[PDB]
Design a protein around this ligand. Structure first.
Ligand code: BEF
Ligand SMILES: [Mn+2]
Length: 128
C-alpha cells in the first residue's frame, strides 16, 4: 500500500494507540493520527484525508461498533477500511462487527506479526 496512506488510530487508552502507531511506523507508515473515542474519531475523519481506520471497541462517548456503523452508513465514508483491534473476543461480538461491515478483526493482546498480517490481508482484498 502507498506509504503516504493516512491512518487514524482510535482507542481510549494511550498505551494501545502508541503500540499501533509504532508498529505502523515499522511498516513504513508515518502519516498517522490518533483519536480517543468515536466522536473524536468522527471529527477527524470529517476533517478529511483519511484512508484507513484502526479501532478499539470499548470507549466512552461512542464505542467502536457505533463508530464502525456510522462510517459504513455515511455516503462520503462508507467504503473506508476499518480494522477492529479489541479485547472483545466472544463470537457474538466478532459476528456483530463482521456483519456491521468490519474489514478485519484483531483480538488483544496481539503480536507485531499478527497486525501486519491482517493489515496486508485488508490491502489485498481492497487492491490497495
Ligand atoms: F477496549 Be477495546 F475493545 F480493547
Ligand atoms: Mn478500550
Amino acid at each position: 500500500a502507498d506509504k503516504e496512506l493516512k491512518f487514524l488510530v482510535v482507542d481510549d487508552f494511550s498505551t494501545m494507540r502508541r503500540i499501533v502507531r509504532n508498529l505502523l511506523k515499522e511498516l513504513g507508515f508515518n502519516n498517522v493520527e490518533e483519536a480517543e473515542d468515536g466522536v473524536d474519531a468522527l471529527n477527524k475523519l470529517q476533517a478529511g484525508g483519511y484512508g484507513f481506520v484502526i479501532s478499539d471497541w470499548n470507549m466512552p462517548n461512542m464505542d467502536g461498533l457505533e463508530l464502525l456503523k456510522t462510517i459504513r452508513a455515511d455516503g462520503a465514508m462508507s467504503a473506508l477500511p476499518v480494522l477492529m483491534v479489541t479485547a472483545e473476543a466472544k463470537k457474538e461480538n466478532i459476528i456483530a462487527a463482521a456483519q456491521a461491515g468490519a474489514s478485519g478483526y484483531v483480538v488483544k493482546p496481539f503480536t507485531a506479526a499478527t497486525l501486519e498480517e491482517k493489515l496486508n490481508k485488508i490491502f489485498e482484498k481492497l487492491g490497495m
